């Protein structure tokens, strides 16, 4: 089954097979108050690694690290970060003491400055406006536009049918939007149907925080999303 929060001290990480060579990485941290969860991906990358997120913090991103080389034992060679907090890039500094070189968004790595977080070293071209998409590796990046932050990515593993939505995608069981200081809940909906019309053969999905479902989640994001705006 796949971890739930209260399975994942603080400062431990859990992997979990999604299909060949296709991993989500499962991570806990606290935030106002309360612990959360948080989802990212590994993706075999030849005889290397991809690394999608970090596991929000230098202490989880380096039990990352080592979960990987115990269970998997190919080098993670490269990162990307699909937005600019802390739950993206926080472990960035570990990731590149450890070898790894580490990517984001030219937006993602201004964004993170502007808030005093790790940077990413490189810059991924070709993501600057909506309906982008590049290849890197075994996946592709795209950007849907503004939502959950103004500079948020989606994944997705052509391979597997993978489509991992990070923080603009919610968990089913999630019903309220929570924090959204960073969000244009305007755009997000819009940012959401382009998600939808670009990934329409998507079989699993994972949201930034919590389990993994279909395309049904994209719907409830929205659904989410929308009742916040109107009250
Ligand atoms: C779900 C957790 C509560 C709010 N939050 C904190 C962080 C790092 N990320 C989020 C988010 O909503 O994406
Ligand atoms: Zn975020
Ligand atoms: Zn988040």
């Known amino acids: 089954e796949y971890p739930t929060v209260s399975e994942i001290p603080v400062g431990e990480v859990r992997l979990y097979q999604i299909a060949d060579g296709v991993w989500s990485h499962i991570a806990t941290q606290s935030f106002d108050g309360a612990v959360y969860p948080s989802n990212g991906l590994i993706v075999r990358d030849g005889d290397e690694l ?17 979960e990987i080389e115990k269970q998997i034992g190919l080098p993670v060679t490269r ?3 699909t937005h600019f907090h802390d739950d993206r890039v926080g472990g960035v500094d570990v990731l590149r003491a450890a070898g790894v070189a580490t990517y984001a968004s030219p937006s993602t790595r201004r964004l993170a400055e502007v808030e005093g977080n790790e940077i990413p070293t490189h810059s991924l071209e070709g993501l600057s406006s909506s309906g982008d ?19 948020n990515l989606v994944v997705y593993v052509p391979s597997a049918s993978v489509l991992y939505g990070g ?8 019903t309220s939007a929570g924090n959204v200081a960073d969000a244009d809940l305007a755009e997000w909906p819009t940012s959401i149907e382009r998600i939808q019309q670009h990934y329409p053969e998507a079989q699993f999905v994972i949201p930034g925080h919590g389990l993994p479902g279909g395309l049904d989640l994209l719907k409830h994001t929205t659904n989410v999303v929308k009742a916040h705006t109107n009250r």
């Open 50 to 66: 991809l690394l999608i997120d970090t596991a929000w913090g230098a202490k989880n991103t380096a039990a990352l690290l080592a």
């Open 79 to 81: 990162a990307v970060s």
């Open 133 to 151: 998409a590049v290849r890197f590796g075994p996946v592709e990046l795209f950007y849907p536009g503004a939502a959950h932050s103004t500079d």
């Open 167 to 174: 923080c603009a995608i919610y968990e089913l069981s999630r």
